[PDB]
Amino acid sequence: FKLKNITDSVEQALKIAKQIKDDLDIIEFHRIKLSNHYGIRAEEHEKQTAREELSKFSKDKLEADLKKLLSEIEKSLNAATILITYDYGGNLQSDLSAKTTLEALKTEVSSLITKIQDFNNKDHQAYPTSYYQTYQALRNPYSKLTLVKDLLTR
């Protein structure tokens, strides 16, 4: 029950984090077709497809996504404390590290929200691409939650 509580929330966090990461993939893919000077020549129709896809993404979508991710991380923390207090001669260090990584994620995701809200582009250009630090910061949560999941799966 308590284990399901923690692991269900982590799974919900993982899902949004994976989304963010996939969203970066989509934007990069189509942006490179639209780029006047970078990447491989695309046909006019790929370029038109790119404009329409890129219009599905905005600064607000990204902020909303991060706020949702942060909420699931904070429910993950809470569930982690319950599981932690519920000691049998000593806490598993797997449990401790999970909580530790989660605490790290929370500040890192909060920081990224504060960072992104002051971007000036409202369109897809609020999303950084790798062609840079922020690009990496945005997809780090998936890795760390992938470790949180791994640690609680015994």
Numbering used by the authors: 269 to 354, 356 to 400, 404 to 426
Article, verbatim:
B. miyamotoi encodes two separate bbk32 orthologs denoted fbpA and fbpB; however, the activities of these proteins are unknown. To better understand the observed differences in C1r recognition and inhibition properties, high-resolution X-ray crystallography structures were solved of the C1r-binding regions of B. miyamotoi FbpA and FbpB at 1.9Å and 2.1Å, respectively. The crystal structures presented here of FbpA-C and FbpB-C show that a defining feature of the C1r-binding domains for BBK32 and B. miyamotoi Fbps is a four-helix core with an extended second alpha helix that presents a functional arginine residue on a small surface-loop.
A structural overlay of FbpA-C, FbpB-Δ5C, and BBK32-C shows that the three proteins retain an overall similar structure around the conserved R248 residue (BBK32 numbering). More strikingly, the structure of FbpB-Δ5C has a significantly altered secondary structure in this region when compared to both FbpA-C and BBK32-C. Specifically, FbpB-Δ5C shows a loss of secondary structure within alpha helix 5 that accommodates a loop insertion sequence (i.e., residues Q394-Q405), which are not conserved in both BBK32-C or FbpA-C. Furthermore, a proline residue (P397) in this sequence interrupts the alpha helical secondary structure in FbpB-Δ5C. A portion of this unique loop structure in FbpB has apparent increased disorder in the crystal structure, indicated by weak electron density surrounding residues 401-403 in this region of the protein. We have previously shown that residues on the fifth alpha helix of BBK32 interact with a non-active site loop on C1r known as the B-loop. Interestingly, although BBK32-K327 is not conserved in FbpB, this did not preclude high-affinity interaction with activated C1r-CCP2-SP. FbpB-C blocked complement activation but, surprisingly, was ~80-fold less potent than FbpA (IC50 = 1,900 nM) despite having similar high affinity for activated C1r-CCP2-SP. Unlike BBK32/FbpA, FbpB fails to interact with zymogen forms of human C1r but instead selectively binds and inhibits the activated form. However, in our serum sensitivity assays, where B. miyamotoi FbpA and FbpB were produced ectopically on the surface of B. burgdorferi, both proteins conferred significantly greater protection to B314 than FbpA DA or the vector-only control.
